Ligand binder design. Structure first.
Ligand SMILES: Nc1nc2c(ncn2[C@@H]2O[C@H](COP(=O)(O)OP(=O)(O)OP(=O)(O)O)[C@@H](O)[C@H]2O)c(=O)[nH]1
Ligand SMILES: [Mg+2]
Lengths: 135, 245, 158, 305, 50, 107, 258, 79, 42, 190
RNA sequence: UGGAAGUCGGAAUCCGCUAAGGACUGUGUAACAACUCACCUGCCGAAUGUACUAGCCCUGAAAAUGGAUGGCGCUCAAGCGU
């Protein structure tokens, strides 16, 4: 199976391809540079983009050299672009942040710093188990 | 006519006989009249006729011709100017349908005793009357279909199942066994191949042969014989009753 | 008390013919080694030759007999040197058989033949020898059969 | 895992038909003599390169999909050497690789010539020459493709035997009850029939004992003669006994309804005993409903003990 | 190729690198040892970026 | 499943109930289908079909002729050269091609 | 696939030797009354000529067996005839002299042991001593890059000459099977070879229409013999050493002398 | 094929003058060329052609052969 | 009733006759005679 | 060649009524009435004998002569339909999921409806409507058998073909998945 | 050949009884069995079979704006031959 998750409602995509977001777990990486988004469509000239709860393909630019030369699956857990949930609430976080996982969705690290978004928490049951604040 | 049935060329050894077989039959018969002193005509009708080999083997001193009826009639001679011997044109009135010629040197009483004591149990052919009702039981289908007890019987081979379905038996494959309905003889009545007095067709006779059940007999009926010494044709019991041409 | 007849092919002077035989004789209640010993005792006069054996079983004892066959009789009458089957394979029966013992084989096969005459029996045996691959009087059994049919060679009657 | 993922291997004529149909239908086919010579050269060069690319893709898929006998476990490698001739297997795949390399070389040569071709007729002759030479190269591979397709189907139907797990290996003469035991203890559909060599290939079932997964391997029967006289069917069992670290269950029928002498059973056990080093051996006396061990000859019982 | 494997195959005797039972047991031993050594050197020797 | 499992399923359960009849009817319709292909295929597919049918007809004629004919090296070589693959083996000092097409300097 | 033994005066076959799965390409009859055959089924067989039964079956060649050679072939071909040019008076003396010549040419380490060599299409050669070794070959003669067509022992029994399809003739020690020297003068495959009676010289006739006489002690081309218009098929050297006969595709016999 | 519901571009039967002239020129050139090849033909030609004869289904063929035989005998007698 | 088995199972089909649209034009005796003169002429 | 006159013959049983007007054939028997329009074929009908119907074509080609055989067999089929009727016995088989077959008669159409459920575990309910004049029953003598009967052979056989073609296995190996409904026997009701 | 019985293979391929039947044309079995074909007989009933030749018709390769026997249209012609 590919990394695109089912049952995800439409939200504002705040992180296009080329964005650098913080790395919110303890795997050793400090940031993730987005090179691709799972489940992205096909339009001429359109950059692929992801929101909170989406799996992207990311490259570590700052962190351990062991994590440096590989492309990792990551899940976006926080974004700064304001988006709306179905209860009418627009919301945003103070930073863009994601966690490194495997293609099945188990986390590489062991703990998450800071809160995670709801959409990430329902879509990935391991992140819901490793999150200290769900927000 | 471009649209035509494609004829299959056979890549087999045996070819069609032709007129040479007719000439060989003519020569064989015409050389076997003078060697024998009686010539019987016998009839076997609506029969499998595979025991004529054993009849030939047991009558090794005699000669039996079982050929085309009109070919044997023209060999013996239908008309008095064409007959090979004196009185052979009288014998050709019995050559209709399925007949055979029996050239012999024996006493005719011996031949009549042999063909009155000759009895072989035989498979029925299509068109005969069934003497007894045959019904295969439900459950496991056996090789004889209930003729012998199932304890002494063997289950029928699994390759015969599509043939039984094509012949009308509602059989099925259960774990490699041919079964009628269910394995325990449930939810299906037994299948009646033939009933009392019903005229058998080829489907029923093929079913009976597949289940190895014989409902007929092989009987040779002597119609009459021509004697070379007297030049006379003596008529026999089936010879009075059978139509002639 | 019933009589049951089983035909099999066995190599003479060999016990292992009972190997494939014993899967079915075991339910009937006989001793496979005893049946194999009886088969070897019956086929002791047929060393190295495949022969057919009739097993008649009744009341859980078996008696053996060797049913004669034309090919086995011809191969025996060829008088090939004794040999082992395991180390010598792909052999050919290219020796010579005399016409007198061909007639003798025909007289033995008279009980199986449906031919009317000993001439027809001799021609059947000559065809079997032709299939085997041997020679009759230094010539081809087809050629002797053709000579017999043409009348150059006279076969005794009975 | 298994070897069911090997794509089907076409014949020589089917291969040529597939490659030429790809070249015919996946590229434009209309070029005019009035066009530019660079345009004509590009058209015919593209034809040659596309044909070589299709051939290389198919041949590389065939080469990479088949097992590498040098990389297998000794059990799997020797099992493929028994079922398949290892020399024939390696020669067939080497011929596939050689044809792939020669097709690439022919393509390079004809592209280099098409760089200097001066007319549409010359370009067409060079393209047809390259395609015909590649077609001849595929045509000489008529027998390896048939052999590899048969090998592929048999490999896809092979059982999956793990050589490094808990395994019960059942061996003995035919008609002693090996498949009966395997069918009774597992879910494997191995046939049980009264004739010898009913089972002509390795079968595997599975059971659970104390929450652990055990695999049980049913083997063809083994006869009493040296390795030079055993055929491939008994070599499957012999390879299994030689390379699988297992629990060997040697099944013996003292009733001798299997058709073999119990002397031969003892002698076969003594002959295959050196394979049982570092392994665990259990003589299973089957068919006790027919003849019991106490009914047997005390000398024979002394030998078995 | 046609007489080795397939519907018209006639091969019955395989080609073996051993002749006796003891040679078979020994050959299996060094075969497993060589396989383990090859696995060890292979081990000694997320996808990577292009 | 393992080994010849489709043949084992064939032994245990058989075909579909109409398999033989459908196969027989299809084999019967082959003549109409082949004539429809001969009259209705277009283009390169039709050309390849025509060449294939021509080859099968020539092969069938050869087979029939051989079956009708059933009821009726070249150069001397030594014994060590027998059964091997050998070639068939078939003043004006003029070459086999005395004249060709002339090629101009512009070409 | 058969070998038939004929009695000359009657023309009748006494024994038929069968068991080969291919064409029997070469047969030899040894002085201990044994028959050696080589066939296309990759096998060499030793038969007892008295009983007509197989004795030995060597199946170590990998392709067709083309030629076999006995160590006593030179004396068995000529019987009691020798360099003296007078014959013994009676049949018993002639048979005794023939047997003495055979035993002298076939003695190995003081006992009679006929030595056999077989050449095959698998580029290899095998040296067998059935009396002392049985089915285990004495040596694998290795080094020919193509098929070996012809092989012959030397009359003194110390050397083996082999002609190959790799345009080469090779010399071998007849005791251990060790390669000695390669004779390189032919440009087409060498078909036949033959020894001189003094075991100094080998004549080889090849496909390149030439005969070549090689001195084996110097390992050098002593003589070149052109004159055949086509391929040379049959080459023989007389037991007297006076003449060499050759014939082939040009249909004319050629006799060569000093 | 989906010809009836979705036909393709029609094949034009309207010839062009250039193609008609080219076809006529090539036909004339082929006819001259085959005259030249028949002139330089080395293939053997019989002096007298094989006459097919009288058809079998002609009801008076036997009678016609009778006048043929009678006329040849009369010519032999006259000569 | 029908004694034989039709191959396609349509047992209601009648016993069909040969499609001979030119039937009845020429008698048998005349055809035998014309065979005789045809053989003589050939 | 154009044939001057060609003719075919149809015997009629004693209890059967045949009416032909403007090539529209109506055949009535003990079991009911069938009707077919044959005005697309050029044919002249006549009563050549008591209980015998003659079919003739004048100045027709070989194809026009051959069409009379089809007309003969069609009218004989209607005769056999109104006399003895037509019966198709079908069998439905399965491996694991039993096929549940429900047979009902719709009142406002008068036609029978066959509902098929649990075909290889499918949740969909297949519904096949019979032709008017076709009667469907579930056999009680044999196991898993439908019996279709009627006067019109074309209607009965097309209904049986619909019942086969609705239970078709898609995207599975047909050498392994053998479930379906098949016509097992064809014959007459009487 | 582990097994191989006409039907996994290699080579031979004859005779008897014949009306005729291959040391077998296919389906089938582990091997057998069983079915089928070549061939023969009974029923029937009068003309057929094969291969070519000549006409007319279909296929016998086609791209890219929507279009062309000049257009409508034409089918015992308003097409083809005299
Ligand atoms: N009376 C009795 N018969 C048995 C017993 N076990 C097996 N048999 C019979 O022996 C025959 C052989 O059974 P299989 O299970 O096939 O034994 P096998 O032939 O060695 O197994 P494979 O060769 O691997 O197929 C069967 O047909 C059984 O009827 C037993 O315990 N008691
Ligand atoms: Mg078994």
């Amino acid at each position: 199976k590919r990394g695109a998750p089912g049952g995800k409602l439409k939200m504002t995509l705040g992180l296009p391809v080329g964005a650098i977001m913080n790395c919110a777990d303890n795997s050793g990486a400090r940031n993730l540079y987005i090179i691709a988004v799972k489940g992205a469509g096909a339009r001429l000239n359109r950059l692929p983009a992801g929101g909170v709860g989406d799996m992207v393909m990311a490259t570590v630019k700052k962190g351990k050299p062991e994590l440096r030369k590989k492309v990792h699956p990551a899940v976006i857990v926080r974004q700064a672009k304001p988006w709306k949930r179905f209860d009418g609430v627009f919301l945003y976080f103070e930073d863009n942040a994601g966690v490194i996982v495997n293609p099945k969705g188990e986390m590489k690290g062991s703990a998450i710093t800071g809160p995670v978004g709801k959409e990430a928490a329902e879509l990935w049951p391991r992140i819901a188990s490793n999150a200290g604040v769900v927000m | 006519p471009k649209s035509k049935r494609a004829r299959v060329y056979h890549l087999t050894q045996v070819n069609k006989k032709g007129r040479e077989a007719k000439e060989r039959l003519f020569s064989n018969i015409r050389e076997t009249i003078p060697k024998y002193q009686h010539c019987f005509v016998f009839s076997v009708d609506n029969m499998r006729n595979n025991y004529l080999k054993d009849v030939r083997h047991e009558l090794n001193d005699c000669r039996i011709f079982f050929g085309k009826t009109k070919l044997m009639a023209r060999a013996l001679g239908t008309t008095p100017e064409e007959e090979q011997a004196d009185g052979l044109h009288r014998l050709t009135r019995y050559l209709t349908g399925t007949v055979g010629l029996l050239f012999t040197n024996r006493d005719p009483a011996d031949i009549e005793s042999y063909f009155s004591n000759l009895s072989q149990v035989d498979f029925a052919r299509a068109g005969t009357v069934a003497p007894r009702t045959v019904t295969v039981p439900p459950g496991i289908v056996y090789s004889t279909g209930g003729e012998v007890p199932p304890e002494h019987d063997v289950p029928v081979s699994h390759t015969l199942e599509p043939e039984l379905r094509r012949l009308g038996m509602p059989v099925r494959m259960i774990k490699g066994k041919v079964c009628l309905g269910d394995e325990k003889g449930e939810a299906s009545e037994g299948y009646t191949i033939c009933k009392e007095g019903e005229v058998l067709d080829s489907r029923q006779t093929r079913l009976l042969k597949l289940f190895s059940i014989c409902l007929s007999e092989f009987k040779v009926s002597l119609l009459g014989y021509w004697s070379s010494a007297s030049g006379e044709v003596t008529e026999l019991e089936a010879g009075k009753t059978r139509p002639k041409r | 008390n019933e009589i049951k007849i089983i035909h099999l092919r066995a190599t003479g002077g060999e016990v292992g013919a009972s190997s494939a035989l014993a899967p079915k004789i075991g339910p009937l209640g006989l001793s496979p080694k005893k049946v194999g010993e009886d088969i070897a005792k019956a086929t002791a006069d047929w060393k190295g030759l495949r022969v057919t054996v009739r097993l008649t079983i009744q009341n859980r004892q078996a008696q053996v007999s060797v049913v004669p066959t034309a090919s086995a009789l011809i191969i025996r009458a060829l008088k090939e040197p004794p040999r082992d089957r395991k180390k010598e394979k792909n052999i050919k029966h290219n020796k010579s058989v005399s016409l007198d013992e061909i007639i003798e084989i025909a007289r033995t096969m008279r009980f199986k033949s449906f031919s009317k005459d000993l001439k027809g029996g001799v021609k059947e045996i000559l065809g079997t020898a032709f299939s085997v691959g041997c020679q009759v009087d230094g010539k081809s059994p087809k050629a002797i059969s053709d000579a017999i049919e043409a009348g150059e060679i006279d076969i005794p009657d009975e | 895992t298994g070897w069911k993922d090997i794509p089907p291997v076409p014949t020589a004529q089917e291969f040529i038909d597939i490659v030429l149909s790809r070249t015919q239908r996946r590229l434009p086919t209309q070029i005019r003599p009035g066009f530019k010579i660079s345009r004509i050269r590009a058209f015919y060069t593209r034809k040659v390169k596309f044909t070589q690319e299709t051939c290389s893709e198919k041949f590389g898929a065939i080469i990479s999909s088949f097992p590498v006998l040098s990389d297998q476990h000794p059990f799997h490698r020797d099992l493929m050497n028994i079922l398949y001739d290892a020399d024939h297997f390696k020669v067939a795949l080497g011929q596939i690789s050689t044809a792939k390399n020669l097709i690439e070389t022919i393509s390079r040569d004809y592209v280099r010539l098409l760089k200097y071709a001066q007319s549409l007729y010359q370009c067409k002759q060079l393209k047809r020459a390259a395609l015909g030479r590649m077609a001849t190269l595929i045509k000489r591979l008529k027998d390896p493709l048939i052999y590899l397709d048969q090998v592929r189907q048999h490999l896809a139907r092979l059982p999956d035997i793990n050589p490094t797990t808990r395994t019960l290996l059942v061996a003995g003469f035919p008609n002693v009850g090996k498949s009966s035991f395997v069918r009774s203890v597992t879910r494997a559909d191995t046939p049980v029939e009264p004739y010898a060599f009913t089972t002509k290939s390795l079968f595997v079932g599975h059971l659970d004992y104390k929450y652990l997964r055990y695999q049980v391997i049913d083997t063809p029967g083994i006869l009493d003669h040296p390795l030079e006289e055993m055929n491939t069917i008994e070599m499957q069992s012999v390879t299994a006994l030689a390379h699988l670290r297992a629990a060997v269950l040697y099944f013996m029928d003292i009733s001798e309804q299997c058709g073999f002498s119990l002397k031969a059973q003892i002698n076969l056990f003594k002959s295959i005993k050196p394979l049982f080093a570092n392994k665990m051996v259990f003589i299973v006396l089957n068919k006790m409903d027919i003849k019991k061990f106490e009914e047997l000859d005390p000398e024979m019982q002394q030998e078995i003990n | 190729f046609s007489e080795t494997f397939g519907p018209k195959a006639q091969r019955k005797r395989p080609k073996l690198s051993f002749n006796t039972v003891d040679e078979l047991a020994g050959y299996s031993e060094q075969s497993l040892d060589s396989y383990h050594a090859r696995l060890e050197e292979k081990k000694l020797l997320s996808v990577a970026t292009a | 499943p393992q080994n010849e499992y489709i043949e084992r399923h064939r032994k245990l359960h058989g075909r579909r109930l109409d398999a033989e009849e459908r196969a027989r009817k299809k084999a019967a319709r082959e003549g109409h289908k082949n004539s429809e292909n001969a009259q209705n295929l277009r283009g390169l597919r039709a050309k390849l079909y025509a060449k294939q049918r021509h080859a099968q007809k020539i092969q069938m004629r050869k087979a029939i002729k051989q079956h009708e004919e059933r009821n009726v090296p070249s150069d001397p070589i030594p014994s060590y050269l027998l059964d091997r693959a050998n070639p068939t083996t078939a003043a004006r000092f003029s070459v086999p091609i005395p004249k060709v097409r002339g090629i101009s300097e512009e070409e | 696939c058969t070998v038939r033994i004929w009695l000359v005066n009657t023309g009748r076959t006494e024994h038929v030797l069968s068991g080969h799965k291919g064409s029997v390409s070469c047969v030899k009859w040894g002085g201990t009354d044994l028959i050696y055959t080589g066939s296309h089924d990759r096998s060499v067989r030793v038969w007892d000529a008295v009983k007509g039964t197989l004795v030995h079956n060597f199946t170590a060649h990998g392709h067709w067996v083309n030629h076999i050679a006995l160590s006593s072939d030179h004396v068995l071909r000529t019987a009691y005839h020798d360099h003296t040019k007078e014959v013994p008076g009676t049949e018993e003396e002639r048979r005794a002299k023939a047997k003495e010549r055979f035993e002298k040419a076939a003695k190995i380490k003081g006992k009679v042991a006929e030595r056999l060599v077989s050449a095959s299409d698998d580029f290899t050669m095998y040296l067998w001593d059935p009396t002392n070794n049985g089915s285990k070959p004495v040596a694998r003669l290795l080094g020919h890059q193509n098929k070996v067509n012809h092989v012959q022992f030397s009359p003194d029994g110390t050397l083996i000459a082999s002609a190959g399809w790799d345009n080469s003739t090779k010399l071998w020690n007849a005791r251990d099977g060790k390669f000695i020297k390669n004779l390189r003068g032919h440009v087409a495959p060498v078909y036949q070879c033959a020894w001189s009676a003094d075991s100094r010289l080998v004549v080889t006739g090849s496909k390149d229409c030439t005969l070549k006489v090689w001195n084996v002690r110097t390992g050098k081309l002593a003589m070149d013999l052109p004159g055949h218009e086509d391929e040379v098929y049959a080459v023989d050297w007389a037991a007297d050493g006076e003449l060499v006969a050759s014939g082939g595709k040009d249909k004319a016999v050629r006799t060569w002398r000093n | 094929a989906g010809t009836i519901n979705k036909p393709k571009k029609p094949t034009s039967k309207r010839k062009t003058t250039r193609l008609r002239a080219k076809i006529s020129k090539r036909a004339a050139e082929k006819k001259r060329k085959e005259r030249k090849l028949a002139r330089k033909n080395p293939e053997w030609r019989s002096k007298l052609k094989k006459d097919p004869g009288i058809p079998n289904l002609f009801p008076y063929k036997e009678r016609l052969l009778q006048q043929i035989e009678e006329e040849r005998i009369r010519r032999k007698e006259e000569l | 009733k029908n004694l034989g088995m039709r191959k396609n199972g349509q047992v209601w089909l009648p016993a069909k006759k040969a499609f001979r649209p030119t039937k009845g034009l020429t008698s048998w005796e005349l055809r035998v005679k014309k065979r005789q003169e045809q053989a003589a002429m050939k | 060649m154009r044939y001057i006159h060609s003719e075919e013959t149809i015997p009629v049983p004693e209890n059967v009524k045949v009416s032909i007007k403007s090539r529209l054939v109506t055949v009535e028997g003990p079991r009911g009435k069938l009707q077919k329009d044959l005005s697309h074929i050029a044919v002249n009908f006549s009563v050549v004998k008591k209980g015998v119907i003659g079919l003739e074509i004048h100045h027709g080609s070989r194809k026009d002569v051959a069409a009379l055989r089809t007309v003969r067999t069609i009218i004989n089929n209607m005769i056999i339909g109104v006399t003895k009727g037509f019966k198709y016995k079908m069998r439905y088989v399965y491996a694991h999921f039993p096929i549940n077959v429900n047979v009902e008669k719709n009142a406002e159409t008068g036609c029978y409806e066959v509902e098929i459920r649990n075909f290889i575990g499918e949740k969909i309910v297949r519904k096949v409507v019979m032709a008017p004049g076709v009667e469907v029953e579930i056999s009680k003598a044999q196991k898993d058998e439908l019996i279709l009967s009627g006067n019109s052979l074309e209607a009965v056989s097309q209904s049986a073909a619909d019942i086969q073609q609705i239970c078709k296995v898609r995207n599975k190996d047909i050498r392994k998945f053998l479930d379906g409904i098949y016509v097992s026997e064809k014959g007459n009701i009487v």
